[PDB]
Design a protein around this ligand. Structure first.
Ligand SMILES: Nc1ncnc2c1ncn2[C@@H]1O[C@H](COP(=O)(O)OP(=O)(O)O)[C@@H](O)[C@H]1O
Ligand SMILES: Nc1ncnc2c1ncn2[C@@H]1O[C@H](COP(=O)(O)OP(=O)(O)O)[C@@H](O)[C@H]1O
Ligand SMILES: [Cl-]
Ligand SMILES: [Cl-]
Lengths: 289, 289
């Protein structure tokens, strides 16, 4: 044990009293299947059970049916007999050299607008945002849904993983004083991609946008910008977006509220380096409110 | 085997001629060791040989010795007898309450200014950017080093993995016509972090910045902004940076050229969804020139 060896000689220690470990998961295997009937795209993971790929399949299916922005047609998700899970979907040839930021904003807004539900805010099944569970139980009030099943779940999860009771308490003050940020606007459920950043966006041979790896649910359309800090969205993206889905009162005031969910998720997934970003946002809203 | 089964049940195929696979690795295990002599931070990976962690340790050490921006003090890297590799470094308690942008820009500019070398552009050893090798052979001309050992290496790799001879040819056209972007300015070698985005930045108990997981070398200071599209650099970041470091002519013109290296690396690591960002930048420069 060279780690133990170094720590007990050179590190000047005589006993190791605790070891806490995170990480270590295995990444998906991504495969191109070549057959006499064309290509298929397959992703396998021997360590993870089938729930994650099933939620992806149902997310791709719901966005595919709006018939707006191009997504891979999903074919099958399930369990590997050897252990693990898989998904099979349409193979798409990426790499459109021009790209089209305005086309992405237009097509995304068409998906928000066309994707409708009579059941309120939520989704048919729970799925995941990264590896974190995403709770999707149907609710009729957006402020109720987002405060409890989005911010509230992530805060409670950080209190349990890190004993971070400070962010848990300040966060729940925010959740309780949140309503003025919504300025009495009426909020219609929209089919959201749910995890929209650079790694999930591509362009096909006609230079049309394609989006991948969803964490779908029906929510406030503005929540789909909550990963924008890793997206490179320009003014041509937003102006093409707002042409189809016009900008609502309080849009600028709420941008941080929707980033906050993903900053909490990154904290809970990737460590306390992200805690300052989340805490900074919570402090400003408490001041502003 | 449901994948082969489905491809011949509902996929309507009769022979699978090839299966091309990427991904599938396992991520690092990250460990907090508590001892009677204080804490240590340890990363292990049972799959990988020690070259990546050894490059990380020497990068930390170089940044540590400038005595400017805070980085974990590295202790030891090496190979696990069971197979794989490890690194041991200083444990730091993350979780700054507000977080501090201007201080990040100040401290980073000070590191560029203090970190010097008599050997030219490059580094003591080759290391890696992500998992991709980063060639650090000492050179005395920056235009030459960046064109060959950064852009050119990435273009060759892209040609070999994807048969993308178009990006390779347009790429080498740009490299050969590159000099006007530099407007004859003299370029001093600066110690660069080399992979500076949100996941590699953190804040300690005094809300001072800490940077992690380097891909270091001595280069043009402006190349350290090549990951800014996933960094969330505020205006207070750049205002504090340019207080320490004088901005050189052509700075705005060259920003995409340094993003391009990372777009190519992301293309090579995570797939052709990133090819459009790289090609768009190469196309604009060929026009502009
Ligand atoms: N020097 C350090 N001290 C304490 N914690 C650290 C240190 N470096 C990283 N961490 C923590 O370890 C975890 C993963 O580390 P990271 O730098 O992402 O390694 P990798 O790039 O191999 O995943 C995160 O929770 C992060 O906050
Ligand atoms: N439907 C698809 N058709 C063709 N290639 C795809 C498709 N979806 C993803 N890819 C490619 O597969 C690789 C991994 O895909 P990604 O969506 O990142 O999966 P994951 O995030 O589960 O690893 C990338 O190279 C990407 O270009
Ligand atoms: Cl990310
Ligand atoms: Cl990234």
């Amino acid at each position: 044990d060279p780690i133990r060896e170094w720590i007990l000689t050179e590190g000047k220690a005589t006993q190791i009293t605790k070891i806490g470990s995170v990480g270590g998961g295995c990444i998906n295997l991504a495969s191109h299947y070549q057959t006499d009937a064309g290509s298929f795209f397959v992703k396998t993971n021997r360590s993870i059970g089938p729930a994650m790929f099933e939620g992806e399949a149902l997310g791709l299916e719901a966005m595919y049916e709006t018939r707006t922005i191009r997504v891979p047609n999903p074919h099958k998700a399930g369990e590997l007999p050897t252990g693990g899970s898989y998904i099979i979907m349409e193979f798409i040839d990426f790499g459109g050299s021009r790209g089209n930021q305005a086309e992405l904003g237009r097509k995304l807004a068409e998906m928000h607008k066309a994707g409708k539900t009579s059941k309120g805010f939520g989704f048919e099944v729970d799925n995941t945002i990264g590896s974190t569970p995403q709770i999707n139980t149907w609710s009729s009030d957006w402020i109720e849904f987002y405060g409890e099943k989005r911010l509230g779940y992530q805060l409670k999860l950080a209190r349990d993983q890190y004993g971070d009771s400070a962010i848990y308490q300040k966060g729940h003050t925010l959740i309780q004083n949140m309503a003025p940020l919504f300025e009495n606007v009426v909020i219609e459920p929209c089919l959201l991609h749910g995890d929209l950043w650079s790694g999930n966006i591509a362009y096909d041979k006609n230079n049309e946008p394609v989006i991948l790896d969803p964490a779908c649910y029906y929510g406030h359309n503005e929540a789909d910008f909550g990963m924008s800090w890793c997206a490179g969205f320009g003014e041509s993206f937003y102006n093409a977006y707002f042409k189809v889905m016009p900008k609502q009162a309080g849009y600028e005031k709420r941008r941080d509220l929707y980033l906050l969910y993903h900053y909490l998720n990154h904290y809970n997934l990737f460590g306390s380096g992200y805690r300052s970003s989340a805490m900074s946002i919570i402090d400003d809203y408490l001041r502003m409110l």
